[PDB]
Amino acid sequence: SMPSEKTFKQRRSFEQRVEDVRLIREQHPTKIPVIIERYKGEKQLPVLDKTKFLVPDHVNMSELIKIIRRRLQLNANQAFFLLVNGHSMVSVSTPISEVYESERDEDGFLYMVYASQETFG
């Protein structure tokens, strides 16, 4: 997986990536901040409509999925898999609220990569 280009986690200035959250923190406190982006080298799935997504702290990480699909507005033939922290969620038994505080970093922003491959590793 020899990476070449920086990651939204690295590239974007942490402090800047932390502040951006502040807003959502002072605006959407009852929401879990996440950063969904195309996998480094993703040519399948289209470029998400947005990068920032406000997930409800009253659902399961799964929802976010059913939510993404809507965004990507893919067909029942298209394959889409949101990788949380770079790892699929084959097992979604945790709330986006926890999955966040269980993954997200001090920054306070989740980082997930979506693509048409959940077993590319």
């Binding site: 951006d20 807003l23 959502i24 605006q27 959407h28 901040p33 409509d49 947005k50 920032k52 997504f53 406000l54 997930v55 409800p56 659902v59 929802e63 976010l64 059913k66 939510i67 699909r69 809507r70 965004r71």
Partner: peptide, 17 residues
């Protein structure tokens, strides 16, 4: 308007299939 990060996207499970 995208002249700032006023409000990100809304993840509503009501607009889902």
């Amino acid at each position: 308007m995208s002249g700032g990060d006023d409000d990100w996207t809304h993840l509503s499970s009501k607009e889902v299939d």
